[PDB]
């Protein structure tokens, strides 16, 4: 370009051009995209607020002399390795005074963003930097896998001992170096570049090379070690801090695993996530079966897979989604979940309501619906629903939302039948596109896996409370789903609930129900420390459904003896059905003690807001106590805390209890730090 | 039966006959099967030893007045509920003075082994009993799922308000009870058996029933709560003690999940593991698609699935396998792994050896092979290999074995191509039997899942050390395997290694190799506290295979410039191949520091035996220290321990170090309990 208004960036730094040819943003320009995305966040929150450039700070991070990371302000394009990181401090709606996180990214312009020892070491270091501070770690993937290479200093001077110099095409005994070669390597001190064994034949002394080590670093196994290091570090980071990855360009080998090990991933359209490229695979099969890497790791694979939680039209869209996703996450590990109250106040009834004889989108109960006669509010704050894994097992709906400002994870059941279309295997001339019918209100291995996955992603890193609008008839006991290990995935759900560290609410919606196999995997007894269950007065629950129940406890013989009240078998059968259905009522549930309370959908939002708020407050107190006697059970900890509540306070009153605790934080604090004399032993 | 030599058991206890008709052993007879199985164990160990009946004790367990479990010696068939348990103390070869464990079992003769509140409470109690003591919990499944029922006291006296008594077949307004009914229930105090609303029409007062609670317990939701309780308890037990389940008869609903939640399961042939029976499902689809429950949960499903770790021809076979499986497990949580040295001494070379140009069964390298010219010993003790999950992802071989007596978990790679035959979906007239070719030395989602699963089952409960004969070219990057989430399963492997608490050995066999994607997921840096890697001098490892490497770093243009040594392209290409292959040598691995040592297959058994023994000894010392300062890193803990070794002891000598530690346990002990003065704060 010639004669441009401002300095041609791609010229001041040719790398920028190189990255763009690659179809991805230049690593050093990414911080700017976060600023823009952060500005948009504010614009949406309060279109009035005037933002200052000091609301967003990006300090690059590099290793010093001691190999320790420090914030430096240098000029872009100076990175000595193919990995860069930035520490970002930004004021957001959830955290007006600022929140921090780190961004790690490959430099696609540096040796094609390969993963070499130095990059892996830097990556691991940055990951540990984040973990220590409890800060999120955002990773921007744009690489070509582990770095490779050969000992280039041996290729120009290696001699081969043939079967006969006359016929080179008759094989070769081995490979060696002449005294001249052994000397050349010595002139560069590159002697350790090869393991040889000096021997002489009917001529001169030929140094047989038994192993080539190479002079340059990052050629073979040393790169694979670095790969494992960061893979395990990432696996570890997922249980410690909020981890997320944006595939801004190709992500290969260790690159792909890193995406999955971070769990939460946003894939930019057209940017493949692959293990082995199409070319290499086509060669392995001989036939040209694959055309583009997008067939192996494109969004039609990973988004449909659940490896990719979301897709983005472009990098900036990816960054916006990342920032939006963080708006529900604590500034750092163990800090209170970020409360962000919007226009939609907690005090209001729930409008949209399901009908027993009318198809509906669960999302309407969650976020609400937009009808002609105005907007119908849902259970959660208007516009607060952030769906994820929306392309995988559509049988269940998972996302983040806010309840009067309180952020939480949500799981809803998709009642409408799912048309899961499975592509054909290009490597199998016989493979045929298959359509899988997935009935609603029913768990399948994929929807069960997704359910378990959502719970763990809510718990780990996000540390969010959760609500499940439980409405499943059970798992599929069919042959195919059983053969496909639906039991393993169903069990993952139990495992994930056992591990949950925040308040959990299980609630069966108005037209909802819970039967045999389903109730089991979501019962409050699984994790009595965090789980509570509620059933709408219009919900249903029982081991079996009416039809099945009557077919066991109400046979024909019992229909007759009962037929002595006033042929008329068809109508009398309905008497049986309704009879059984009279057992599956929330009232029985309360009488039996399997739920905390029966509720009314319209009043659900008001009830849960105060209930959740009350619990978050008591939880906070329970933790503050957990650090002293360390030998008291949750029961003993909450009992002592509730003994502090003023006698006139009704422990059953969520609003009162929450209101009192929030007015006496300091008072409660002094009390806690007054149990120091329980230093004891 | 009439005139029998001894008392007819099935008569003294008709239940025994009932259980047999059911095709399963009578719960109270099971203890006898463990005795017989335990006797066989000895017979195999030392055919000489004379056993006394006091080597096996079985004390039934029941709840007392306070609901606490105690050992009682009553007469069989007295169980008040449909769940029974026994505490077994038995002297075994691994533990001559005795080892203990509990056995929980449904009583198929008691209300068809349904799961009622009382049974779930007893089950949970027994599970917690085991966990507290760190003792294994064996579960014998024979049930019909959660217990169901209706309020039988309401079916004979409920009246229905029709549209018109003249035409009963015109619907009904609701259901009510007359003053007589409301009085009948009051005569039995069964008033809380129904929620009614007294109202009067143009006649008499009819009590409209809005909800039926029932008088008898265990009818609906209260059974589902109990189900969740034991499911979560089992999920928890798996990470605490050794859990195993034997499906001795049908296992339904909560029954099925309990099998999977315990993880380790042995399925008796013909005993289905199902969620919903065929009948109920056929009705749901209208068409008679399923004939037997074995199509839904038979061994051809669960054994092929991996839900069932093993199959057994009969109950006694199941019990024998259970006992055999426990012979590698500690008497209780945190006790040393049981050492059981047999005839096959540690001091001997490894006979069977793989050939680069000859198909072989990995099992031969593990346990050895039986040839005409005598027996060829393998790496592990002869006859010590106990394969599990042998019916699932045959691409990998997992089992338990002994190394000179030391029990450990083993993972080997199946090189021979697998012919995975997948049955057709009976519910899909289009479904067709499909054959899946699974190439050897390659990870597929199923073999990756199995690998991760084995690691966790080795770690949890079994607390065993582990060795992986790593020999994989990588994961399948194809479209189908990628679409099938091979990345998720590959990551499970990393996660499982991070969690491993015992010494781990990764070793690439003679003709074995490890490339790019594979090395990553098994590198020692993943868990440096427990992992160590070794490569046979005849092994190979690199980011890419020779073929792929040359196709990137050795193009035609480089072949020419190198062709100036002495058309002849085909033979010169081979020069490239061999050139690259000279980089993937164990020697480079050592030079680069990615492995601890290169080894010789024949000497592997000698080396690993002392290495493992040495490590188990140092680990023991590290733990003993971990309980005091609680702020020292593994590095600081082992360094202090190694500073105690006599100056003349060579820290690198596994045999010496192990031999010294074993001779100074008490001396080391005094030292440890001499750091009490490091009570400090």
Structure notes:
2 copies of one chain form a homodimer. Chain A has 681 residues and is an alpha/beta fold. Chain A has 3 domains: 1-148 and 218-333, 2-enoyl-CoA Hydratase, Chain A, domain 1 (Alpha-Beta Complex); 152-217, Biotin dependent carboxylase carboxyltransferase (ClpP/crotonase fold), CATH 2.40.460.10; 334-678, 2-enoyl-CoA Hydratase, Chain A, domain 1 (Alpha-Beta Complex), CATH 3.90.226.10. In chain A, the strands form 8 sheets. In chain A, strands 2-1-3-4-5-10-12-14 form an 8-stranded mixed β-sheet, sandwiched between helices. A 7-stranded mixed β-sheet of chain A has the order 17-18-19-23-25-27-29. The radius of gyration of chain A is 31 Å and the shape is globular. The interface between A and B is large, with 140 and 140 residues.
What would you say about this model in short?
The structure is a homodimer of 681-residue chains. By secondary structure, chain A is of the alpha/beta class.
CATH topology of the largest domain in chain A: 2-enoyl-CoA Hydratase, Chain A, domain 1
| Strand percentage of chain A | 15-25%
Query: How many individual domains of chain A?
Result: 3
The CATH C-level class name of the largest domain in chain A: Alpha Beta
Multimeric organization = homodimer
Question: Which term fits the overall shape of chain A?
Answer: globular
What portion of residues of chain A is helical?
25-40%
Structural class of chain A: alpha/beta
Q: What gap, in angstroms, lies between the N and C termini of chain A?
A: 75 Å
Major sheet attributes of chain A: 8 strands, mixed
Number of helices of chain A: 24
**CATH-defined architecture of the largest domain in chain A:** Alpha-Beta Complex
User: What Rg of chain A, in angstroms, do the CA atoms define?
Assistant: 31 Å
User: Biggest sheet of chain A: strands side by side, in what order?
Assistant: 2-1-3-4-5-10-12-14
CATH homolog superfamily of the largest domain in chain A: 2-enoyl-CoA Hydratase, Chain A, domain 1
- Kindly report the greatest chain-chain contact and the residue count on each side: A-B, 140 and 140 residues
Binding site for CoA (chains A, B): 250, 553, 555
Protein name (chains A, B): Acetyl-CoA carboxylase
Binding site for acetyl-CoA (chains A, B): 146-148, 517
Subcellular location (chains A, B): Cytoplasm; Endoplasmic reticulum membrane
